[PDB]
Write an enzyme that holds these catalytic residues in place. Structure first.
Site, mmCIF file in Angstrom:
data_model
loop_
_atom_site.group_PDB
_atom_site.id
_atom_site.type_symbol
_atom_site.label_atom_id
_atom_site.label_comp_id
_atom_site.label_asym_id
_atom_site.label_seq_id
_atom_site.Cartn_x
_atom_site.Cartn_y
_atom_site.Cartn_z
ATOM 1 N N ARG A 27 -123.706 146.515 2.479
ATOM 2 C CA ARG A 27 -123.050 145.809 3.573
ATOM 3 C C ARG A 27 -123.272 146.583 4.871
ATOM 4 O O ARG A 27 -122.900 147.762 4.970
ATOM 5 C CB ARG A 27 -121.562 145.632 3.260
ATOM 6 N N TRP A 29 -122.030 146.642 7.776
ATOM 7 C CA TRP A 29 -120.943 147.203 8.546
ATOM 8 C C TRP A 29 -120.345 148.432 7.879
ATOM 9 O O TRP A 29 -119.393 149.014 8.403
ATOM 10 C CB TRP A 29 -119.892 146.113 8.820
ATOM 11 N N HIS A 64 -120.622 141.419 10.767
ATOM 12 C CA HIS A 64 -119.893 142.216 11.760
ATOM 13 C C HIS A 64 -120.770 143.145 12.599
ATOM 14 O O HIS A 64 -120.433 143.402 13.751
ATOM 15 C CB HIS A 64 -118.779 143.008 11.082
ATOM 16 N N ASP A 139 -129.979 133.546 0.489
ATOM 17 C CA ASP A 139 -128.725 133.445 -0.242
ATOM 18 C C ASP A 139 -128.287 131.979 -0.277
ATOM 19 O O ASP A 139 -127.970 131.391 0.767
ATOM 20 C CB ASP A 139 -127.706 134.349 0.454
ATOM 21 N N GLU A 141 -125.640 129.462 -2.014
ATOM 22 C CA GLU A 141 -124.411 129.340 -2.779
ATOM 23 C C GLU A 141 -123.829 127.942 -2.609
ATOM 24 O O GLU A 141 -124.365 127.085 -1.903
ATOM 25 C CB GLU A 141 -123.409 130.395 -2.341
ATOM 26 N N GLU A 244 -112.846 146.579 -0.438
ATOM 27 C CA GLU A 244 -111.534 146.932 0.097
ATOM 28 C C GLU A 244 -110.793 145.695 0.584
ATOM 29 O O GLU A 244 -111.367 144.814 1.233
ATOM 30 C CB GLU A 244 -111.665 147.949 1.241
HETATM 31 C C1 LIG Z 1 -125.046 138.302 -2.354
HETATM 32 C C2 LIG Z 1 -123.600 137.884 -2.248
HETATM 33 O O1 LIG Z 1 -122.722 138.395 -2.950
HETATM 34 N N1 LIG Z 1 -123.340 136.930 -1.335
HETATM 35 C C3 LIG Z 1 -122.042 136.326 -1.030
HETATM 36 C C4 LIG Z 1 -121.230 137.144 0.004
HETATM 37 O O2 LIG Z 1 -121.061 136.323 1.157
HETATM 38 C C5 LIG Z 1 -119.873 137.588 -0.526
HETATM 39 O O3 LIG Z 1 -119.367 138.697 0.221
HETATM 40 C C6 LIG Z 1 -118.649 138.406 1.454
HETATM 41 O O4 LIG Z 1 -119.540 138.226 2.558
HETATM 42 C C7 LIG Z 1 -118.909 137.902 3.825
HETATM 43 C C8 LIG Z 1 -120.018 137.691 4.831
HETATM 44 O O5 LIG Z 1 -120.374 136.305 4.823
HETATM 45 C C9 LIG Z 1 -119.791 135.673 5.986
HETATM 46 O O6 LIG Z 1 -120.403 136.171 7.159
HETATM 47 C C10 LIG Z 1 -121.882 136.028 7.169
HETATM 48 C C11 LIG Z 1 -122.405 136.659 8.428
HETATM 49 O O7 LIG Z 1 -122.466 135.589 9.343
HETATM 50 C C12 LIG Z 1 -122.250 136.061 10.676
HETATM 51 O O8 LIG Z 1 -123.335 136.893 11.053
HETATM 52 C C13 LIG Z 1 -124.685 136.208 11.035
HETATM 53 C C14 LIG Z 1 -125.798 137.205 11.335
HETATM 54 O O9 LIG Z 1 -126.825 136.598 12.162
HETATM 55 C C15 LIG Z 1 -124.657 134.995 12.007
HETATM 56 O O10 LIG Z 1 -125.953 134.313 12.085
HETATM 57 C C16 LIG Z 1 -123.524 134.040 11.553
HETATM 58 O O11 LIG Z 1 -123.543 132.863 12.334
HETATM 59 C C17 LIG Z 1 -122.125 134.778 11.512
HETATM 60 O O12 LIG Z 1 -121.709 135.088 12.859
HETATM 61 C C18 LIG Z 1 -122.261 134.518 7.032
HETATM 62 O O13 LIG Z 1 -123.681 134.359 6.960
HETATM 63 C C19 LIG Z 1 -121.572 133.918 5.773
HETATM 64 O O14 LIG Z 1 -122.031 132.549 5.523
HETATM 65 C C20 LIG Z 1 -121.114 131.790 4.692
HETATM 66 O O15 LIG Z 1 -121.506 130.424 4.647
HETATM 67 C C21 LIG Z 1 -122.796 130.175 3.991
HETATM 68 C C22 LIG Z 1 -122.972 128.680 4.058
HETATM 69 O O16 LIG Z 1 -124.183 128.234 3.402
HETATM 70 C C23 LIG Z 1 -122.844 130.786 2.498
HETATM 71 O O17 LIG Z 1 -124.198 130.672 1.848
HETATM 72 C C24 LIG Z 1 -122.331 132.262 2.462
HETATM 73 O O18 LIG Z 1 -122.177 132.705 1.106
HETATM 74 C C25 LIG Z 1 -121.024 132.422 3.242
HETATM 75 O O19 LIG Z 1 -119.972 131.808 2.449
HETATM 76 C C26 LIG Z 1 -120.004 134.169 5.840
HETATM 77 O O20 LIG Z 1 -119.441 133.423 6.949
HETATM 78 C C27 LIG Z 1 -117.974 139.052 4.248
HETATM 79 O O21 LIG Z 1 -117.272 138.688 5.483
HETATM 80 C C28 LIG Z 1 -116.983 139.453 3.080
HETATM 81 O O22 LIG Z 1 -116.402 140.729 3.372
HETATM 82 C C29 LIG Z 1 -115.076 140.722 3.949
HETATM 83 O O23 LIG Z 1 -114.049 140.740 2.966
HETATM 84 C C30 LIG Z 1 -113.993 141.930 2.097
HETATM 85 C C31 LIG Z 1 -112.824 141.712 1.145
HETATM 86 O O24 LIG Z 1 -112.932 140.363 0.562
HETATM 87 C C32 LIG Z 1 -113.896 143.214 2.970
HETATM 88 O O25 LIG Z 1 -114.020 144.396 2.188
HETATM 89 C C33 LIG Z 1 -115.020 143.226 3.979
HETATM 90 O O26 LIG Z 1 -114.959 144.444 4.760
HETATM 91 C C34 LIG Z 1 -114.988 141.970 4.846
HETATM 92 O O27 LIG Z 1 -113.733 142.038 5.507
HETATM 93 C C35 LIG Z 1 -113.964 141.868 6.918
HETATM 94 O O28 LIG Z 1 -114.363 140.511 7.271
HETATM 95 C C36 LIG Z 1 -113.365 139.450 7.079
HETATM 96 C C37 LIG Z 1 -114.004 138.113 7.495
HETATM 97 O O29 LIG Z 1 -114.658 138.301 8.748
HETATM 98 C C38 LIG Z 1 -112.078 139.801 7.859
HETATM 99 O O30 LIG Z 1 -111.070 138.825 7.569
HETATM 100 C C39 LIG Z 1 -111.567 141.232 7.474
HETATM 101 O O31 LIG Z 1 -110.340 141.566 8.170
HETATM 102 C C40 LIG Z 1 -112.672 142.323 7.631
HETATM 103 O O32 LIG Z 1 -112.918 142.501 9.031
HETATM 104 C C41 LIG Z 1 -112.348 143.744 9.496
HETATM 105 O O33 LIG Z 1 -113.086 144.920 9.062
HETATM 106 C C42 LIG Z 1 -114.466 145.062 9.540
HETATM 107 C C43 LIG Z 1 -114.973 146.391 9.058
HETATM 108 O O34 LIG Z 1 -114.613 146.531 7.671
HETATM 109 C C44 LIG Z 1 -114.501 144.992 11.058
HETATM 110 O O35 LIG Z 1 -115.875 145.007 11.465
HETATM 111 C C45 LIG Z 1 -113.748 143.707 11.603
HETATM 112 O O36 LIG Z 1 -113.795 143.628 13.045
HETATM 113 C C46 LIG Z 1 -112.295 143.595 11.030
HETATM 114 O O37 LIG Z 1 -111.483 144.616 11.621
HETATM 115 C C47 LIG Z 1 -117.680 139.571 1.718
HETATM 116 O O38 LIG Z 1 -118.400 140.839 1.736
HETATM 117 C C48 LIG Z 1 -120.074 138.084 -1.944
HETATM 118 C C49 LIG Z 1 -118.869 138.798 -2.528
HETATM 119 O O39 LIG Z 1 -117.804 137.913 -2.839
HETATM 120 O O40 LIG Z 1 -120.405 136.987 -2.815
HETATM 121 C C50 LIG Z 1 -121.211 135.867 -2.282
HETATM 122 O O41 LIG Z 1 -120.445 134.760 -1.936
#
Ligand SMILES: CC(=O)N[C@@H]1[C@@H](O)[C@H](O[C@@H]2O[C@H](CO[C@H]3O[C@H](CO[C@H]4O[C@H](CO)[C@@H](O)[C@H](O)[C@@H]4O)[C@@H](O)[C@H](O[C@H]4O[C@H](CO)[C@@H](O)[C@H](O)[C@@H]4O)[C@@H]3O)[C@@H](O)[C@H](O[C@H]3O[C@H](CO)[C@@H](O)[C@H](O)[C@@H]3O[C@H]3O[C@H](CO)[C@@H](O)[C@H](O)[C@@H]3O[C@H]3O[C@H](CO)[C@@H](O)[C@H](O)[C@@H]3O)[C@@H]2O)[C@@H](CO)O[C@H]1O
Ligand code: CA
EC number: 3.2.1.96
Length: 787
Positions: A27, A29, A64, A139, A141, A244
């Site tokens: 990840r 971030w 992020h 990816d 899903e 986390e």
């Molecule tokens: C291989 C695999 O397992 N794949 C998935 C996987 O998604 C999933 O893990 C989760 O992934 C989340 C990321 O996916 C989302 O965001 C991406 C990124 O998109 C942005 O960036 C792109 C880059 O160019 C842009 O183009 C885009 O437009 C966005 O701006 C998206 O691509 C993604 O797409 C969704 O829709 C498509 C539709 O087709 C789908 O195919 C995807 O599967 C997906 O559903 C998503 O929108 C990630 O966010 C998750 O982690 C969070 O939760 C954890 C606990 O559950 C935590 O440990 C982790 O740190 C993350 O927590 C942060 O983010 C949350 C949401 O934003 C906040 O609510 C939290 O508070 C926290 O933010 C805080 O902390 C961070 C630092 O830690 C800080 O930077 C912040 O400011 C804040 O303080 C998760 O990893 C995986 C595992 O389940 O399985 C498969 O589904």
């Protein structure tokens, strides 16, 4: 060069030189070079640079991290170089939405051939070339909130195929990997079906339990479909580390839970789903490619205890394992060494397949690992004169086709040298076996000798095809092939029972593919007859040898070659014959009336059309006559055009189509439709299909017509067109201007009765009452007669 190194790494992975693979999603971030939109560091504790050589492929999973973050240049100018030195390739991961119109570059190009071609190149440049990595991972899903349209999936496939022309095994730049990761089974993954040929690996996320007592039900049943598009060596399954602050819905327990008595518990793989995925192997095809983890930056952190599994975004139950900490990738290292020590990945060697020519051809076609042997379930073609021995061929226990081509130096074939699948109708082809001296296929339930080129076996000195499922009847082609092999033994030796064994056959029974009687007859004998018994009966062999009944089978069992009776003595007719268990007989009388029975009682001159069904399809069609027969009537009302009705003109029209998938009714208990048969012929009976015959909506009998009358225009002198519309309608409503030809006074599901040879061009049927207070309905009206 940094590009050459990655190129060689990618080639070695694609050629299968790493053994089983271990991969992980990092990840972004949680790399210490990552900075948010506010330009501040997110987490200093970890870095991709410390990922160890046990990680064969490291996927960049983005969130992020801001577009201007130092992380990107740190990745491209620093992480890639250091990870390449240890053998680790880097792959960028992007979501399917980057390809289907919903986000990123996808929003800037039209959904056209040239637009998608251009999108693919922009994607490759932005996410692969500009980032400095060794491949691309899409990816795909399930989108729960806003389902993707077929056009969105069709486009992503088109873009994906264009990417595949730029990178991957079928692209001009073969130094990059092309990968899909997915949560979707084959039936829900149209993009996978189209792109599968161009993929290096398929990464199947399987976080959390997958059903059944070993928790891998979905993996096994998914692999049963996946195997038809990719090789087992391309299949990676995935578990997740503990993220986390994960909430309900993202709590998988793929690793060991927190132990306050043992801070190291998260690093222990014993008992974990992760260990099970490391050890799981597909049951067909071959060994898998390896496993992967999501969130490898959380490697070693113990999972939050099961008591917390109900926490949510709005119901926080924070725990010490929610803290961020430095990892040393202990779990990843253990899982990789477990897999590489799995002896099923030892290469096939002299001791599996002694013959080096046999061994080479097997390896080229089934894979390199001992564990592939008992799993490979496709086709093996063995050729040439260098192969002298077939020992070890029995180890491909699920081979579904064995093809022995010109093996001039093979002298022996026995069941013990043959795969177990040969006992279950695996295909067996052998051509040009000019050295073969002993051909032993006894006890294999072979149903024919087809595929065995008996003419070429010029050196045969003994054979044993006894205890099979052969039909050695006079007309059977397998009797003829048997004689050729008896001639081959004769050219070398006096034939004995032992060196030409062929006894104890148990040929299996089949339904005949056709039946002889196209036109049957019964006398008017006033007795019952069974149409299945008399006309659609019997069993055939695989060679289409017909056996009508039990004594035909008793005759069959005495069949003999050179006085030797080849059918096994204990083989019974009831073991051979087809029971006709699901068979139904559909009868259409000259009435056009329809019944479902195999029994007819020959009481009067009649003619049926007979459609016999096996439960799923019609297996036979014939005409049955009783005495003189009777000429089939036509529905003279078919397609009649409506001239007037108290109901809706357009719903009135539907009682003369061919179907019962409609209803005609009015706002009340009575109505009428007047219709014009166009021509004039002789009507002998009429039929009304009541409300409950509705095939498009299950309709209860309370809506049935219960009273009604069928009538004729009772004038013949008048011109309908001479009236204009209002009076026309009025004339046709006047009861005085019609005379009854049939009355109905029972709400039968289907009502049929005869007419005293009526003929009238113009008709009207009147509903006079219903089974209940509900508005009466009917679906179809028939007037039955000649010409
Ligand atoms: C291989 C695999 O397992 N794949 C998935 C996987 O998604 C999933 O893990 C989760 O992934 C989340 C990321 O996916 C989302 O965001 C991406 C990124 O998109 C942005 O960036 C792109 C880059 O160019 C842009 O183009 C885009 O437009 C966005 O701006 C998206 O691509 C993604 O797409 C969704 O829709 C498509 C539709 O087709 C789908 O195919 C995807 O599967 C997906 O559903 C998503 O929108 C990630 O966010 C998750 O982690 C969070 O939760 C954890 C606990 O559950 C935590 O440990 C982790 O740190 C993350 O927590 C942060 O983010 C949350 C949401 O934003 C906040 O609510 C939290 O508070 C926290 O933010 C805080 O902390 C961070 C630092 O830690 C800080 O930077 C912040 O400011 C804040 O303080 C998760 O990893 C995986 C595992 O389940 O399985 C498969 O589904
Ligand atoms: Ca109809």
């Amino acid at each position: 060069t940094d590009q050459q190194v990655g190129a060689k790494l990618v080639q070695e992975i694609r050629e299968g030189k790493r053994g089983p693979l271990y991969a992980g999603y990092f990840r972004t971030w949680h790399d210490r070079a990552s900075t948010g939109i506010d330009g501040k560091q997110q987490h200093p504790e970890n870095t991709m640079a410390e990922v160890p050589k046990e990680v064969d492929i490291l996927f960049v999973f983005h969130d992020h991290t801001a577009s201007d973050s130092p992380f990107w240049s740190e990745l491209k100018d620093s992480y890639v170089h250091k990870l390449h030195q240890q053998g680790t390739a880097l792959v960028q991961t992007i979501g399917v939405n980057e390809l289907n119109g919903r986000t990123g570059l996808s929003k800037d190009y039209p959904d056209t051939p040239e637009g998608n071609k251009a999108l693919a190149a922009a994607i490759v440049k932005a996410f692969v070339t500009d980032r400095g990595v060794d491949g691309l991972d899409i990816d795909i899903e399930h989108e729960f909130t806003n389902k993707r349209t077929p056009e969105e999936d069709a486009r992503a496939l088109n873009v994906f195929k264009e990417i595949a022309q730029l990178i991957g095994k079928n692209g001009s730049d073969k130094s990059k990997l092309l990968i899909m990761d997915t949560t979707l089974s084959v039936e829900n993954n149209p993009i996978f079906k189209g792109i599968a040929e161009d993929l290096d690996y398929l990464l199947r996320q399987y976080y959390g339990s997958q059903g059944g007592e070993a928790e891998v039900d979905t993996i096994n049943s998914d692999w049963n479909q996946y195997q038809n598009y990719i090789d087992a060596s391309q299949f990676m399954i995935g578990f997740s580390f503990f993220e986390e602050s994960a909430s309900k819905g993202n709590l998988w327990f793929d690793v060991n839970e927190y132990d306050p008595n043992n801070p190291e518990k998260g690093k222990d793989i014993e008992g974990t789903r992760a260990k099970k995925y490391a050890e799981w192997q597909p049951s067909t095809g071959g060994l898998k490619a390896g496993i992967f983890s999501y969130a490898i930056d959380r490697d070693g952190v113990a999972h939050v205890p099961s008591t917390y599994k109900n926490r949510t975004s709005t119901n926080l139950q924070r725990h010490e394992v929610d803290n961020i900490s430095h990892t040393d990738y202990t779990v990843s290292r253990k899982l990789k060494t477990l897999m590489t020590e799995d002896k099923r990945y030892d290469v096939i060697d002299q001791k599996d397949i002694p013959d080096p020519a046999l061994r080479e051809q097997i390896i080229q076609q089934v894979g390199q690992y001992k564990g592939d042997l008992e799993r490979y379930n496709k086709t093996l073609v063995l050729t040439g004169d260098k192969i002298q021995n077939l020992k070890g061929l029995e180890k491909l226990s699920k081979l579904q086709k064995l093809e022995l081509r010109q093996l001039s130096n093979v002298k022996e074939i026995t069941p013990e040298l043959l795969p177990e699948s040969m006992k279950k109708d695996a295909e067996l082809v052998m051509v040009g076996m000019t050295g073969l001296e002993k051909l032993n296929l006894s006890g294999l339930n072979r149903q024919t000798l087809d595929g065995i080129d008996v003419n070429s076996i010029t050196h045969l000195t003994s054979f044993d095809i006894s205890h099979n499922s052969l039909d050695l009847s006079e007309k059977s082609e397998d009797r003829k092939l048997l004689m050729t092999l008896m001639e081959q033994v004769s050219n070398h030796q006096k034939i004995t029972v032992k060196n030409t064994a062929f006894e104890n056959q148990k040929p299996k029974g089949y339904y005949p593919q056709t039946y002889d009687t196209k036109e049957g007859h019964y006398d008017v004998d006033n007795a019952e007859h069974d149409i299945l018994t008399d006309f659609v009966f019997g069993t055939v062999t695989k060679r289409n040898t017909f056996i009508g009944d039990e004594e035909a089978f008793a005759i069959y069992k005495e069949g003999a070659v050179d006085g030797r009776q080849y059918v096994s003595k204990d083989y019974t007719y009831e073991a051979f014959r087809k029971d006709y268990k699901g068979y139904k007989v559909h009868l259409t009388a000259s009435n056009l009336g329809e019944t479902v029975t195999s029994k007819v009682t020959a009481t009067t001159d009649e003619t049926y059309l007979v459609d016999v069904s096996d439960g799923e399809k019609v297996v036979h069609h014939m005409k049955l006559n009783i005495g003189s027969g009777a000429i089939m009537m036509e529905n003279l009302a078919k397609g009649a055009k409506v001239i007037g009705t108290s109901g809706d003109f357009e719903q009135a029209k539907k009682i003369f189509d061919g179907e019962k998938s409609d209803r005609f009714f009015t706002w009340g208990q009575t109505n009428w439709i007047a219709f014009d048969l166009g021509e004039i012929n002789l009507a002998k009976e009429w039929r009304l299909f009541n409300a409950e015959t509705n095939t498009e909506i299950k309709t209860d009998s309370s809506l049935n017509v219960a009273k009604g009358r069928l009538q004729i225009l009772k004038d013949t002198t008048i011109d309908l067109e001479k009236m204009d519309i209002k009076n026309r309608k009025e004339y046709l409503s006047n009861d005085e201007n019609w005379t009854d030809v049939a009355q109905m006074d029972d709400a039968k599901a289907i009502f049929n009765s005869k007419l005293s040879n009526v003929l009238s061009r113009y008709w009207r049927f009147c509903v006079d009452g219903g089974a209940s207070s509900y508005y009466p309905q009917y679906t179809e009206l028939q007037i039955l007669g000649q010409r």
